Amino acid sequence: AVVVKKDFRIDLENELFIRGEVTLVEDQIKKPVLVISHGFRGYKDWGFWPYVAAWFAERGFYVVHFDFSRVGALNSGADEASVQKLSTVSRELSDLDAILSNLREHRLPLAEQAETERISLLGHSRAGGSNIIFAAEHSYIGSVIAWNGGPPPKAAAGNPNPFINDDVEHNKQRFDTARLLASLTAPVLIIQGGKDREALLEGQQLLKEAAPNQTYISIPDADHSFGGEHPFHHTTPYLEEALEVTHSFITKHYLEHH
Ligand SMILES: O=[N+]([O-])c1ccccc1
């Protein structure tokens, strides 16, 4: 049982691109799909992501994780205005659309082993919110999990990004995850570490109050990265628990029960 890792690159407009990887144990059968989105400071090789992708591949998934367009732009020497424009939630939604379209058109590596009837999303931090938005707007997403994220987007930390300020202001209803969670009939899981930063914990309580239909799990002693921040020598009890709970939540919802 070898975990294969197949690199790919999706060419977008002009000089932009998405680099990604498919992680899979090749069993000559279609496997449910997990698409992973990294957080605002992440990239596909950051911290626990390679371990996480392999962990789900060992447990029966066809896994996709990838660099958002803004990562390749930065690495390619794009200037600050270009990188800032690519850093909106709106661009995340568009990059996810390119990943999912290429998956659904069987252009990703080993796509004959992807069960595209059974797509789940896993998003970390800021991508937890954008994954909820994407899932709510796309019927073909069957379930979504957010790790230490979920609340509606707002202006990023550090330097002012005006494109982010405009994106947030022109999309207040569209990006309101409390309203989206309340009406989404697909199962949503939010895992939140109890040691995380305290404006985030308050945002998470508003989601649970707004949308008690969904599933909210606390890991009381875990921080924003479940201890798996870069570099990654080994897993942690908080990351293993988040993986277990995420896995259990997905399989619990594969069969339609009533
Ligand atoms: O209250 N909670 O346990 C909770 C609330 C939001 C997200 C995760 C857990």
Q: What is the 3-state secondary structure (H, E, C) of 66-83?
A: ECCHHHHHHHCCCCHHHH
Tell whether ligand 1 has an atom less than 6 A from the beta carbon of residue 179.
no
What contacts 151, CB < 8 A, 6 or more positions away?
129, 177, 178, 200, 203, 204, 206, 207
Dihedral (CA of 80, 47, 175, 194) sign: negative
Q: What residues does each domain of the chain span?
A: 3-252
Tell whether ligand 1 has an atom less than 6 A from the beta carbon of residue 154.
no
Q: Look up the CATH superfamily of 3-252.
A: Alpha/Beta hydrolase fold, catalytic domain (3.40.50.1820)
**Can you tell me the distance from the alpha carbon of 57 to that of 3, in angstroms, rounded to the nearest whole number?**
7
Q: Is 61 helix (H, G, I), strand (E, B) or coil?
A: coil
Facing residues of 32 across strands? 115
**Can you tell me the distance from the alpha carbon of 195 to that of 91, in angstroms, rounded to the nearest whole number?**
30
Neighbours of 197 (CB within 10 A): 11
DSSP state, 88? S
In ligand 1, which atom is closest to the CA atom of 207?
Answer: 6
Q: Is 107 helix (H, G, I), strand (E, B) or coil?
A: coil
User: 31-37 and 114-124 as β-strands: parallel, antiparallel, unpaired?
Assistant: parallel
Cis peptide before 109 (omega within 30 of 0): no
Nearest CA to ligand 1 atom 3: 218
Dihedral (CA of 229, 134, 210, 215) sign: negative
E strand residue ranges, the chain: 3-11, 17-25, 31-37, 62-66, 114-124, 141-147, 188-193, 215-219
Resolution of the entry in angstroms = 2.2
Q: How far is CA 69 from CA 18, 216, 232, 255, in A?
A: 5, 30, 24, 35
Contact 131, 144 (CB under 8 A): yes
CA of 199 to the centre of ligand 1 (A): 13
Contact 152, 176 (CB under 8 A): yes
139: its two tokens: 């019927």
Contact 43, 67 (CB under 8 A): yes
**Can you tell me the distance from the alpha carbon of 237 to that of 242, in angstroms, rounded to the nearest whole number?**
9
**Can you tell me the distance from the alpha carbon of 224 to that of 147, in angstroms, rounded to the nearest whole number?**
8
22: its two tokens: 């498919």
